[PDB]
Amino acid sequence: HMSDVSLKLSAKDIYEKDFEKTMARGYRREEVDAFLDDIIADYQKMADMNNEVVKLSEENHKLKKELEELR
Amino acid sequence: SLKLSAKDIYEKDFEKTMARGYRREEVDAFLDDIIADYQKMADMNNEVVKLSEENHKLKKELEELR
């Protein structure tokens, strides 16, 4: 569908992501992992919105048609 | 409805460590992608609201002329 958006990542991609570890100055893993868990919850919430836009668009079209068919 | 915004992710800093931390360039590059995705999710959320609002309105217009 034309309305479809294409995300770079998915909930599962982020959940599976394995960063290189270093003994150089890097990021505390526990803080990055905890932040990604919130991000995963957000991706999951939004995952079906391509379909939700199509459905709303299609009902929108039907309703406008009924209305015009009155007047 | 979302726990975070693109801005929250854009502005996030992590504590530094010498003790087997994550490579910063890899994490940064990965969050750059998540920030772009959050912009697309905000646009689609806005679209779902506009369409749900329009659909409610169209139903009320049909109902009042019934």
Strands (E), A1-71: 21-22, 26-27
Mutate to test the interface with B, among A15, A19, A61, A70 (most CBs of B within 10 A): A19
CB contact under 8 A, A21 and B17: no
Residue B7 neighbours by CB under 8 Å, 6+ apart: none
What length is written for chain A?
71
* Exposed/middle/buried for residue B8 (C-beta within 10 Å: 0-12, 13-18, 19+): middle
Q: Which positions in chain A touch B46 (Cβ < 8 Å)? A: none
- Which two structure tokens, joined as six digits, stand for A44? 């999951």
**H-run or E-run covering B13:** none
* Conformation bin of residue B20: beta by default, left when phi > 0, alpha when psi is -120 to 50: left
Chain B: closest CA distance from residue A36 (Å): 9
Q: Is A19 on the interface with B (CB under 8 A)?
A: yes
Taking a C-beta distance cutoff of 8 angstroms, is the pair A11, A44 a contact? yes
Q: Is B26 on the interface with A (CB under 8 A)?
A: yes
